[PDB]
Write a protein that binds this ligand. Structure first.
Ligand SMILES: [Cl-]
Ligand SMILES: [Zn+2]
Ligand SMILES: [Zn+2]
Lengths: 350, 350
């Protein structure tokens, strides 16, 4: 497993190499395939957002605000700060009678180079509603208001909204509280770390809940909420990230068969609804995939995730070809000459 | 040897980066190491002083009257500031060439501050803006000086590139077959060789400067190497630019060493003999070369600065000018410190 790498070359000469870790799990979290160390203790960063959205949606009273599926997809989002994302953030603040000054996240350069270039041309200074995490933050303000906890300090560990987040994360992971560690995210919220396979487990449970809903099975309130989060992400993938973004292009290509989301510093998680491909992989239910590039390189992350989907047989060559520019990153110099490429000397193990 | 620089979020491991380093004496003998000090490595722009030597040794180039700042630009990966473009143009005029003779292409500036001003003006960079433009003018100079014609000066079959290839292997003390060649972002042949030989090149620069200063008899080659060292140290803003690590490093040391970046996170430093180098157990100059395996530049500058502190090169006051690179900021969008950088590696002798 110490040999699982993605490697870039220049004229066949090794340039950089990147250690890969991955877990492929069933709906109960049993490990089916791995790369690297599948239990690596890993900060999930923004890939935890579906679990935080579950804590929001399980907060009594939040249903009264009338958030719709696109709002819930924005809670699940690391969005590009496109004008539609900012506008929806402001519209969600109005639903809870809050204002931009109540947010405790900060502005940052857009995750999209094209958006950021427009901002630079305009001397635009991003503010709190422009945060890629702005939907999650409005959701947590919503829950704070709904239980009467006060919006001041909704982002601090001592607040009941964060106590709810912390218990919800551990429960979805099937871990004791002491086995989840906490830091602080760029958006200024508590953010969890846990073994990488458990990030796969969370997304397997998302997809499993979607399968149960679609088949008409009786569900707990939790499974119904998980099915709702899956549906929202898959129905509004442009809210989850934006134009040209991997997460958006991936979920559009698969048209409801899976959901996926990025974690900052190069983690990724995918929940796959039961299919011919999942059955061929040896399980009778939904499937979860999680990935971490040890050194944090995002370009390599998206190449590896796409390569892994091909090796697992998920989708078809035609579906996955929508991701070709991520799968095989361009290596072209300033005069248009191809100078190298990207290779995948790793081996899936069962 | 498992040597890493490790970033954390709240003490939880975020990313880790494998480090390779060689510390060599003036004859290339290995004194200290991290990782694999003989890793086959693409030197990229850190090879520029060897390419400048090939230029300066070309018959007739002396008649063009290149000065020290011109030679510093030949050795540069500059930020494309207005002064770098103006010097490139002055060098083209010295050889009666024009911008359309260049065979490098434009690219987003290596400086974020420069790139933002370009984006604001809708400026599209051209050949004269290349971070390698000084090297390219020098190659055009050599091609013209021997009557080989400017057309195709960048191609492997051109006599200028034959001179570069030979000069690189000679400075490395390697046979031609032990240097591999690809194509750079700037569309020139670019060499790969064991990482320690990159340190050997820079040790030879600093040794030549020591010998020029001590008034030793010198070959034409050692005299030119001494000139290259002097030029980089006298004009470190030409080698890179405002705010750049290479510039701030050489300014802080005020002639005691030179250093330059290789794209995809290699670094090389040539250290003139000093109380520090004697304390490390050599009676001459010293060379340092570093590669971050995954290509991360931020981690490269942190590691190089930590290495200078471990090796005792400079004073605490001198190295404090590099504090922002040594321990990069880890502060979120709300001004809260969220993490840090650590150096759990240990330098081994021999
Ligand atoms: Cl390139
Ligand atoms: Zn966040
Ligand atoms: Zn170049």
């Amino acid at each position: 497993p110490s040999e699982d790498f993605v490697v870039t070359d220049r004229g066949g000469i090794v340039e950089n190499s990147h250690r890969v870790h991955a877990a492929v799990v069933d709906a109960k979290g049993r490990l089916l395939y791995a790369l690297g160390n599948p239990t690596r203790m890993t900060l999930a960063r923004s890939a935890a957002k579906p679990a935080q959205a579950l804590a929001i949606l399980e907060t009594e009273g939040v249903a009264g605000y009338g958030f719709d599926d696109a709002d819930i997809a924005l809670m699940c989002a690391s969005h590009s700060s496109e004008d539609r994302h900012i506008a929806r953030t402001r519209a969600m603040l109005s639903k809870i009678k809050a204002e931009e000054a109540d947010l405790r996240c900060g502005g940052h350069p857009s995750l999209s180079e094209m958006v950021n270039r427009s901002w630079i041309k305009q001397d635009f200074i991003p503010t709190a509603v422009c945060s890629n995490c702005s939907g999650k933050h409005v959701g947590m303000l919503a829950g704070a208001r709904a239980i009467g906890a006060g919006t001041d300090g909704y982002h601090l560990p001592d607040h009941p909204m964060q106590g709810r987040v912390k218990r919800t994360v551990a429960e979805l992971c099937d871990l004791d509280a002491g086995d989840v560690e906490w830091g602080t995210d760029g958006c200024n919220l508590p953010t969890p770390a846990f073994p990488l396979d458990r990030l796969g487990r969370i997304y397997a449970k998302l997809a499993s809940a979607a399968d149960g809903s679609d088949a008409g099975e009786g569900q707990s309130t939790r499974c119904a909420a998980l099915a709702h989060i899956f549906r929202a992400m898959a129905r509004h993938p442009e809210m989850v990230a934006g134009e040209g973004r991997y997460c958006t292009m991936l979920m559009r290509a698969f048209d409801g068969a899976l959901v996926g989301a990025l974690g900052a510093d190069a983690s990724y998680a995918i929940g796959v609804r039961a299919s011919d491909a999942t059955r061929q992989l040896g399980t009778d239910g939904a499937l979860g995939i999680s990935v971490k590039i040890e050194d944090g390189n995002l370009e390599m992350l998206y190449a590896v995730v796409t390569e892994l989907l091909e090796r697992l047989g998920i989708g078809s060559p035609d579906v996955r070809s929508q991701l070709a520019s991520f799968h095989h990153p361009q290596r072209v110099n300033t005069m248009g000459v191809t100078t190298g490429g990207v290779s995948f000397p790793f081996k899936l193990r069962g």
